[PDB]
Amino acid sequence: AAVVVSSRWNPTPEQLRALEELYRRGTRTPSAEQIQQITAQLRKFGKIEGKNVFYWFQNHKARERQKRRRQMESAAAEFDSAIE
Amino acid sequence: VVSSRWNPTPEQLRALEELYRRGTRTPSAEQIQQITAQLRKFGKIEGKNVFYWFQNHKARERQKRRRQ
DNA sequence: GCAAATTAATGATTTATTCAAG
DNA sequence: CTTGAATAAATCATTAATTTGC
């Protein structure tokens, strides 16, 4: 019987899937009321607060950009090696 | 019995693994051809085998080791 | 011991995404 | 808004491990 305290919010798999689908529908920089409403809904899956949503979308946008940039340095790896 | 799908020779396997440990995870076309060149000393292999091996390895290590 | 049966691994294909040309 | 570039996720398919009954 015991406690564990978190230093960083982590999305539950359900909160994560919800945020990823908000992203697939085109959400990129939620407004303040958007942040609050999203938060109010995702709190049903578990712990989450407004700044967590705010950061999640910033970090996800940046990481997608960086990911997609580093997919470009590969320079058509799949076609040049697998199809021809 | 003859082969329909490639399978790494036990040495190509250790070399592909070493490359993954030292940071090669999403190799480029060029590098892929470089790697394929080297690994054929140890037997049959083509660029498609190398490209898929890194894709599948990376995906399934994510499955095993990533926490969510 | 040995293969047929069944299960686990993994190679190869397909599908759904992403950013950002145009 | 559309779509080119290029996956990585999900899935399909075949091989290797292994289990099983003899």
Residue numbers in the entry:
A (entry chain A): 89 to 172
B (entry chain B): 92 to 159
Cite, word for word, the article reporting this structure:
In plants, the WUSCHEL-related homeobox (WOX) family of transcription factors function as central organizers of several developmental programs ranging from embryo patterning to meristematic stem-cell maintenance through transcriptional activation and repression mechanisms. The Medicago truncatula WOX1 gene, STENOFOLIA (STF), and its Nicotiana sylvestris ortholog, LAMINA1 (LAM1), regulate leaf-blade outgrowth by promoting cell proliferation at the adaxial–abaxial junction through transcriptional repression. While the HD contacts DNA, the WUS box is essential for the recruitment of the TOPLESS (TPL) family of transcriptional co-repressors.
Here, the crystal structure of the homeodomain (HD) of STF (STF-HD) in complex with its promoter DNA is reported at 2.1 Å resolution. There are two protein molecules and one DNA molecule in the asymmetric unit of the crystal. The overall structure of STF-HD adopts the canonical HD architecture comprised of a three-α-helical bundle core connected by well ordered loops and a long arm of peptide at the N-terminus, with overall dimensions of approximately 42 × 32 × 25 Å. The two protomers HDA and HDB are positioned more than 8 Å apart and are bound on the opposite sides of the DNA, making no direct protein–protein interactions with each other. There are also two additional STF-HD molecules bound on the same DNA (HDA′ and HDB′), which are related to HDA and HDB, respectively, in the crystal via crystallographic symmetry, forming a tetramer. The STF-HD tetramer interacts with the DNA extensively. HDA and HDB are bound at two TGA motifs that are arranged as an inverted repeat and are separated by five base pairs, making contacts with the DNA via both the major and minor grooves. Arg96 (N-terminal arm), Asn147 and Arg151 (helix α3) serve as a molecular probe for STF to read out the TGA DNA fingerprint. The two crystallographic symmetry-related STF-HD molecules, HDA′ and HDB′, mainly contact the DNA in the minor grooves using polar and basic residues located in the C-terminal halves of their α3 helices.
